């Protein structure tokens, strides 16, 4: 009709912090209520009054808890410093111009404790492919600066994080994006995003246990590693997997680039060997990602 307002639908904060509420609209007096209730019986709005623009001599803003930072023509942004649990509920902006009156409601949800952030990761992380892990917190207020810190197994992750802050009519948040090149060994590790205040102090955090796809990593062993193998002797080689994500399907053995016929187990036994068995040996274990191979063992037969 005669009023248009724009602001986030819900604003989030916690006890002891501040809330900064962007607001635009399109005035004789402004009054901020908490949970305004119209009484039809007395024809008035009842409830606690958080701000009155009419009280003359009203002290400068930062000497008040509830501060109206707006104008007479476009701006209705608000500031609560400090914000309290009892402020949780509905903020009623009662505006009066010369003919019409309006009550605009903005939701302020105050938690007793700092709420946690939320990590957004790609559905597909694989080794040596760069991905941006994202940490999102739905809070920002100029009077209460904060920071987001990435941890790896409780240890301040070494990479650089990038922090950005949005305080608009559409959304209010602080976001951190950290780029890093995951390896096979991040799979199964715990990544944490800690929300802190200025000092390195804990407020809340979000946590993930990384799922990193990788081709199989292999460790090859040989029995006569320390010693001599002449003709006839026995030699045992084993193929160990360190990790594989997803699970492996088969195992194979290769000698000087050619795959050994009917040698698809994790143990290679050469018994009654000849000098022709000399050469370079490896194993191959296959993933749904692809195959991995271990190091080569060069068996030299002595005679």
């Amino acid at each position, epitope marked *: 009709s005669k009023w248009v307002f724009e602001h986030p639908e819900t604003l989030y904060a916690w006890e002891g912090a501040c809330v900064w509420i962007p607001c635009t609209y399109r005035l004789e007096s402004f009054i901020l209520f908490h949970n305004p209730e119209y009484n039809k019986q007395t024809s008035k709005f009842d409830g606690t009054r958080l701000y009155e623009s009419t009280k003359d001599g009203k002290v400068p803003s930062e000497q008040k808890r509830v501060q109206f930072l707006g104008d007479k023509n476009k701006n209705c942004t608000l500031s609560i410093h400090p914000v309290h649990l009892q402020d949780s509920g509905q903020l009623g902006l009662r505006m009066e111009s010369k003919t019409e009156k309006w009550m605009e409601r903005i939701h302020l949800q105050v938690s007793e404790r700092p709420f946690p952030p939320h990590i957004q990761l790609p559905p597909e992380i694989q080794e040596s492919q760069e991905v941006t892990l994202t940490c999102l917190l739905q809070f920002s207020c100029y009077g209460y600066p904060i920071q987001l810190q990435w941890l790896l197994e*409780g240890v301040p992750m070494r990479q650089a994080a990038v922090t950005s802050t949005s305080l608009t009519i559409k959304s209010v948040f602080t976001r951190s994006e950290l780029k890093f090149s995951p390896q096979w060994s991040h799979h199964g590790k*715990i990544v944490t995003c800690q929300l802190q205040d200025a000092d390195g102090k804990f407020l809340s955090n979000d946590t993930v*246990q990384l799922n990193v796809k990788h081709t199989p990593k292999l460790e090859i062993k040989v029995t006569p590693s320390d010693a001599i193998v002449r003709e006839g002797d026995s030699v045992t080689m084993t193929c160990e997997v360190s990790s594989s994500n997803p*699970e492996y399907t088969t195992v194979s053995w290769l000698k000087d680039g050619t795959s050994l016929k009917k040698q698809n187990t994790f143990t290679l036994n050469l018994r009654e060997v000849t000098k022709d068995q000399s050469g370079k040996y490896c194993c191959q274990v296959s993933n749904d990602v692809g195959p991995g191979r271990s190091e080569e063992v060069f068996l030299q037969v002595q005679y």
Partner: antibody
Amino acid sequence: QVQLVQSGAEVKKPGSSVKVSCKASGYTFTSYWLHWVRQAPGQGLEWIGYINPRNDYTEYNQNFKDKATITADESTNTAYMELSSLRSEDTAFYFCARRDITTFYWGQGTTVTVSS
Amino acid sequence: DIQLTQSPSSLSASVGDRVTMSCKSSQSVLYSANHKNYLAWYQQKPGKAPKLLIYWASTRESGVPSRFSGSGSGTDFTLTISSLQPEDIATYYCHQYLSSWTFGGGTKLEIKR
């Protein structure tokens, strides 16, 4: 306060299937992997598999791919482990567990007994 | 396919004796980032869930008696009970938790007589 609560004892006929529940309390259910561990009578602890409750990605022990199916429900903060074709060697204690950075949390365990 | 071999399978020892038990992994469990060994030690009583004693191979968890200690790094680990008490009769397991989970065969502790 952070505790894993498993379902009650189960008695199933051979060839049947069974689905054990594991309810998580006092933490964010999607933040840590949820594992399942088997302990046959007289034997040791044998890992079955795990599910990532955030993306439902699962990995298993090689010996349980034909046997166990681990699923999760974030709306109920409950993870499940289903056993398919029951035989005598399935009679065991079954635990759900998870790791934190500094410690582990284990469920109280559920017995699966296979008999007609 | 990371197997853990624990030895011996069973120990019998006196009250007041100092007891050690070893856990050897076929592959390294030392993590390259935080130089921590992802091996843990558990104590299990019959019909009950295993109770964590050591995490990261050397850190005793809260309220665990000081007689229990974990040592080793890489592929060789040892759990030490400095003064065997009657309440320490249990089966002890080692556990690697890098990505997946594998457990040792267990070490059953009994009283020698």
